[PDB]
Design a protein around this ligand. Structure first.
Ligand SMILES: *[C@@H]1O[C@H](CO)[C@@H](O[C@@H]2O[C@H](CO)[C@@H](O)[C@H](O)[C@H]2NC(C)=O)[C@H](O)[C@H]1NC(C)=O
Ligand SMILES: *[C@@H]1O[C@H](CO)[C@@H](O)[C@H](O)[C@H]1NC(C)=O
Ligand SMILES: *[C@@H]1O[C@H](CO)[C@@H](O)[C@H](O)[C@H]1NC(C)=O
Ligand SMILES: *[C@@H]1O[C@H](CO)[C@@H](O)[C@H](O)[C@H]1NC(C)=O
Ligand SMILES: *[C@@H]1O[C@H](CO)[C@@H](O)[C@H](O)[C@H]1NC(C)=O
Ligand SMILES: *[C@@H]1O[C@H](CO)[C@@H](O)[C@H](O)[C@H]1NC(C)=O
Ligand SMILES: *[C@@H]1O[C@H](CO)[C@@H](O)[C@H](O)[C@H]1NC(C)=O
Ligand SMILES: *[C@@H]1O[C@H](CO)[C@@H](O)[C@H](O)[C@H]1NC(C)=O
Ligand SMILES: *[C@@H]1O[C@H](CO)[C@@H](O)[C@H](O)[C@H]1NC(C)=O
Ligand SMILES: *[C@@H]1O[C@H](CO)[C@@H](O)[C@H](O)[C@H]1NC(C)=O
Ligand SMILES: *[C@@H]1O[C@H](CO)[C@@H](O)[C@H](O)[C@H]1NC(C)=O
Ligand SMILES: *[C@@H]1O[C@H](CO)[C@@H](O)[C@H](O)[C@H]1NC(C)=O
Lengths: 277, 369, 49, 98, 50, 49, 49, 49, 123
């Protein structure tokens, strides 16, 4: 059922510069041509962002790395990714991440998006995967792991079906997706945005504001989370990582001066605690 | 007369007095709500065969309905009803957005714990409201539904826990509680406890031990598009007139005009620099309307002494006469850079100044004066 | 308008402080008159043109 | 010299700028809650009944009167400074020009 | 570090600083003012009103 | 035994831990009201008389 | 520091109407600048030493 | 929190009023000093130079 | 301490409380001393934050370099945000980031106590 993946190379973590990102519209109110001061949890500007990746390079001394660790959730998480092939699929949020407590699972399985809250028993190396069929050139879902069991399932949502493109595309990362995850008074709050990119290393420098996506009435304690990646198949050694990268930062209470343009879009911001200027 | 009241006098000295502002009264009212036709699921929420145990309380989303709670008057009786969010009399004039109903059974003595700021077994280990709570708490006696002769042991509550709950959490774990130094791997005795206990609800229990059904309605108001509205009939939309209005529960007075503002899909209201609503998205036609105050201003009165004459002239600072937000005319309309002066005779002779008006213009009371 | 703009309920409460509003305007009026006086004192030294 | 030195007339420009700021400040201050649940009277009135609304409104009225009183006090102080300047100018007109 | 040493002294200057009240130095020092004064006296004695 | 209301009983409490949670396992109170403190703050405090 | 020194909870409340702090500081700055200006006008009349 | 907020807001309003009073007094006093400084500057030019 | 909360720096005190006194008070009626509940000694309490900071800025339309003045810091672990380089002690505070030039000039941005600053030369 569950598979403990092997052959992975051990590498130190990478770090990057958050620059000026992680700003989201803090309200449901239209404002334009104004500056506005807000005190919510934000990613601090020019903060330490942990850079994780999935890669398969070559034989002999190949990197062979596939990062899917359990990370602290702390007070909220800034998550972003750069990819070209839909490798990052979803997340697990919870505390013990085992059968003793309720956990939240949000996954895009290339059919639909499924959100569940259950006393799930998770695999140590949860993953999804796609098998490449040389015959008729097809990329198709073949594996789903994530958990060995689920029980009471106190929350559930399933989206309408769609076809997700699973092609093992080559090139530069083309899609930047950003999310902000918060857990407030029982709600799991998600903000997000999709930005077209063309890059090969770390997060691009630039600025954008994320829009509210959903307020989920979950009711559970989250202290840790894990990122779910898909594998490419040609047991525990028979896999190719594909190429994707993801960044994780943490939110802190901060005061920001936000600038709205003439059409109500937030176009700039000042992190009031960054420096004396 | 306004000048006389301001000065607390029945006599006014020669000179110029300011007399408030030109104001406009509304003549029509506008009420706009999303055209929701379904009645809210009062039956499912209040007439359920079974309620959840308090340790594992239920939560349901309510949307796309009319909150006409008068339907409960014929058959329901509530021992408790308390609104934290709004005054009870305003419930039918409002719209609600993220509306959820929490539902469970507790003992009568524990009803007092379902409130912000309380402590006790329920408040600390089973169900907690935030100190900052918007919503209404409803409870009633269910002794004839939930109590059983030999004891209804179906309803459970948490007795043992290591830390307190945060608002709106549901801890449904059954792991053994360690009260002492023993690790409690299993054991289920001595200083190790099964954390949940039953309520022996019986028809012979005194009131504090009778079961109560509790429903908590949690909601946000006036900052997002409505999904649930009270039982209020809408009207037609009236533009370019001074009107009273109610848009999804948000009231005010002003003049509505078409807007060129483009709200994001999730925005319902817009605000100006002073954080006052200045735009709305109409709930039936998704048109953005701008709101301008009806009143504006600039009125002052030129008065000869009242012990001489009762004639006055009135200056309208922001009126360009050359019915223009003017109280009366009657000719004698003179346009100056200081405003439109009505009631004074304009002459072309220069004179020493007596009562100054502004921008080089001065008045006097002179000759049949 | 500053405090209870177009609000009947607010206005009726505001009446308790009506003597406060009167004093605010008296002070501003005194300034306004003075400003025209200052101009005349500096420029109109000679009334023969 | 006047054409080429923009700062030369700063003394007159400053008067204009200070007065504009004083009024812009009063408008911005309207957004303050002053202990009230909301800075918008319409929000208070829509959600609360009369006896509850009165409490929240009275908090706003007190704060708003305080803002206006602050404004008036500042204008009186500035008026005194200007009066002194005007008196000096009048003196110079008589003693330097006449 | 000096205000910790002075807790026993109950120095008003520290009390003011701890409550957010400070004092700013002048731009011209006493020495600079003395130089202006001396220049004016030297000028007057040497050349009068010229 | 409890005292008659006309002759109520006053007892001094000292040198102890006010771990009121021990009452959760047995007592049920219909009335509970604090006047000087908020109930949620009780576990962080020390009392004298 | 004067109103809410070293306290997170009252700081967040103070921000509610913190625009008043800015105005107070502007007034005091205006005085501070003026005091150095006064010194220069009285003493630095001759820029030759 | 909700009870503390009421008590805190009472203190904040009072504390802010004290600072505003201070500033007003400093502005008035500053004006008196300005007048003295202007006189001193006048004397420097007319009595010394 | 026995339910009384706060933030600060605790040091040994030379105050001697009467046997029935638990807490001390300042002129502002704030707490300034406590008896420790287990060790019978008296501690003084001093706020952590002392203050005095201002920033010297060339216009931002020219450059984003700034110098920071710490009014109550003597640089001769300094209670500064960064030691940086170019640490210049003046009588108006410890100034960090400005170069010290011994050539006098006309004052541009006044700092205080005879010191001014300007932006100039790779400026
Ligand atoms: C949310 O989960 C965390 C982690 O399990 C809980 O924190 C633990 O609480 C126990 C009991 O007091 C301590 O022994 C552990 O050391 C704590 N762990 C950590 C990482 O802090 C926390 O109490 C839970 N939240 C709620 C409301 O119950
Ligand atoms: C993975 O390894 C852990 C030990 O680190 C073991 O307990 C678990 O059963 C293994 N899972 C699988 C699927 O082999
Ligand atoms: C954090 O950022 C600093 C630069 O500000 C860098 O030197 C450091 O290596 C980064 N990572 C960690 C773990 O400190
Ligand atoms: C995705 O999840 C839905 C709902 O559980 C299921 O019906 C569907 O078959 C799943 N698709 C894949 C590829 O696992
Ligand atoms: C491609 O061929 C394999 C068998 O070799 C079959 O299992 C798979 O379904 C085929 N793919 C498609 C898209 O038909
Ligand atoms: C959770 O699942 C277990 C399965 O053994 C069951 O015994 C327990 O009653 C369930 N809890 C709730 C709240 O449904
Ligand atoms: C606002 O949108 C219009 C198109 O409707 C566009 O021309 C204009 O540049 C936009 N304004 C801003 C500040 O981006
Ligand atoms: C509950 O059912 C009874 C009939 O048994 C009906 O009269 C009553 O109105 C119902 N209550 C609700 C809320 O639907
Ligand atoms: C009903 O709602 C739709 C969608 O908002 C709107 O287009 C339509 O005009 C509304 N109609 C009524 C009350 O007839
Ligand atoms: C009134 O409007 C006309 C244009 O129609 C303009 O020429 C005139 O100056 C305005 N009057 C005043 C007092 O500004
Ligand atoms: C207990 O309290 C006394 C003071 O009454 C103290 O001297 C002793 O060290 C304390 N001891 C512990 C916890 O051992
Ligand atoms: C800083 O401390 C030194 C002694 O190390 C002293 O001589 C100097 O005067 C002090 N500086 C100031 C500005 O007080």
């Amino acid at each position: 059922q569950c598979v403990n993946l092997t052959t992975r190379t051990q590498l130190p973590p990478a770090y990057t510069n958050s620059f000026t990102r992680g700003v989201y519209y803090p309200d449901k109110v239209f404002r334009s041509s104004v500056l506005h001061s807000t005190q919510d949890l934000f990613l601090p500007f020019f903060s330490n962002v942990t850079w994780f990746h999935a890669i398969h390079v070559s034989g002999t001394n190949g990197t062979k790395r596939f990062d899917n660790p359990v990370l602290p959730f702390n007070d909220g998480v800034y998550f972003a990714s750069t990819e070209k092939s839909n490798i990052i699929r979803g997340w697990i949020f919870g505390t013990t991440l085992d059968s003793k407590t309720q956990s939240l699972l949000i996954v895009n399985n290339a059919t639909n998006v499924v959100i569940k809250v259950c006393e799930f028993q998770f695999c140590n190396d949860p993953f999804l995967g796609v098998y490449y069929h040389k015959n008729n050139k097809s990329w198709m879902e073949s594996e789903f792991r994530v958990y060995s069991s689920a029980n009471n399932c106190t929350f559930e949502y399933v989206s309408q079906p769609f076809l997700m493109d699973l092609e093992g595309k080559q090139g530069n990362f083309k899609n930047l997706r950003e999310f902000v995850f918060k857990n407030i008074d029982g709600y799991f709050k998600i903000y997000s945005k999709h930005t077209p990119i063309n890059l090969v290393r770390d997060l691009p420098q630039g600025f954008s504001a994320l829009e509210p996506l959903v307020d989920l009435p979950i009711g559970i304690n989250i202290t840790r989370f894990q990122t779910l990646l898909a594998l490419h198949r040609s047991s525990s050694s028979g896999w190719t990582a594909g190429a994707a990268a993801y960044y994780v930062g943490y939110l802190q209470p901060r005061t920001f001066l936000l600038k709205y343009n003439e059409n109500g879009t937030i176009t700039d911001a000042v992190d009031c605690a960054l420096d004396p200027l | 007369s306004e000048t006389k009241c301001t000065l607390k006098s029945f006599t006014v000295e020669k000179g110029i007095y300011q007399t408030s502002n030109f104001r406009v009264q509304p003549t029509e009212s506008i009420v706009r709500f999303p055209n929701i036709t379904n009645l809210c699921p009062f039956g499912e929420v209040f007439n359920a065969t079974r309620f959840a145990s308090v340790y594992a309380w239920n939560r349901k989303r309510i949307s796309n309905c009319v909150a006409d709670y008068s339907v409960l008057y014929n058959s329901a009786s509530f021992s408790t009803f308390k609104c934290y969010g709004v005054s009870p009399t305003k419930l039918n004039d409002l719209c609600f957005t993220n509306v959820y109903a929490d539902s469970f059974v507790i003992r009568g003595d524990e009803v007092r714990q379902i409130a912000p700021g309380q402590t006790g077994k329920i408040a600390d280990y089973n169900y907690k409201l935030p100190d900052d709570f918007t919503g209404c708490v409803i409870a009633w006696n269910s002794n004839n539904l939930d109590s059983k002769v030999g004891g209804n042991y179906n309803y459970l509550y948490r007795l043992f826990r290591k830390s307190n709950l945060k608002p709106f959490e549901r801890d449904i774990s059954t792991e053994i509680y360690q009260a002492g130094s023993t690790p409690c791997n299993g054991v289920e005795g001595f200083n190790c406890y099964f954390p949940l206990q039953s309520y022996g609800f019986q028809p012979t229990n005194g009131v504090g031990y009778q079961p109560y059904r509790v429903v908590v309605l949690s909601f946000e108001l006036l900052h997002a598009p409505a999904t649930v509205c009270g039982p209020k009939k809408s009207t037609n939309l009236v533009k370019n007139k001074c009107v009273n209005f109610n848009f999804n529960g948000l009231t005010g007075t002003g003049v509505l005009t078409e807007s060129n503002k483009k709200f994001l899909p999730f925005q319902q209201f817009g605000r100006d620099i002073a954080d006052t609503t200045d735009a709305v998205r109409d709930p039936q036609t998704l048109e953005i309307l701008d709101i301008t105050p009806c009143s504006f201003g600039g009125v002052s009165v030129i008065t000869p002494g009242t012990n001489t004459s009762n004639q006055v002239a009135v200056l309208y600072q922001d009126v360009n006469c050359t019915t223009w937000r003017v109280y009366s005319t009657g000719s004698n309309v003179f346009q100056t850079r200081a405003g439109c002066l009505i009631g004074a005779e304009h002459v072309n002779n220069s004179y020493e100044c007596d009562i100054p008006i502004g921008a080089g213009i001065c008045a006097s009371y002179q000759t049949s004066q | 308008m500053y405090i209870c703009g177009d609000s009947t309920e607010c206005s009726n409460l505001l009446l308790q402080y009506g003597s406060f509003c009167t004093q605010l305007n008296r002070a501003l009026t005194g300034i306004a008159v003075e400003q025209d006086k200052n101009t005349q004192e500096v420029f109109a030294q000679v009334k023969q043109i | 010299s006047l054409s080429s030195t923009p700062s030369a007339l700063g003394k007159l420009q400053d008067v204009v700028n200070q007065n504009a700021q004083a009024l812009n400040t009063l408008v911005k201050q309207l957004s303050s809650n002053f202990g009230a649940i909301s800075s918008v009277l319409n929000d208070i009135l829509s959600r609360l009944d009369p006896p509850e609304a009165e409490v929240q409104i009275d908090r706003l009225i007190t704060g708003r009167l305080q803002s206006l009183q602050t404004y008036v006090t500042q204008q009186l102080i500035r008026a005194a400074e200007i009066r002194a300047s005007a008196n000096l100018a009048a003196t110079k007109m008589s003693e330097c020009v006449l | 570090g000096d205000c910790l040493g002075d807790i026993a002294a109950r120095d008003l200057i520290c009390a003011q600083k701890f409550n957010g009240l400070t004092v700013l130095p002048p731009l011209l020092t006493d020495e600079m003012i003395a130089q202006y004064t001396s220049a004016l006296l030297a000028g007057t004695i040497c050349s009068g009103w010229t």
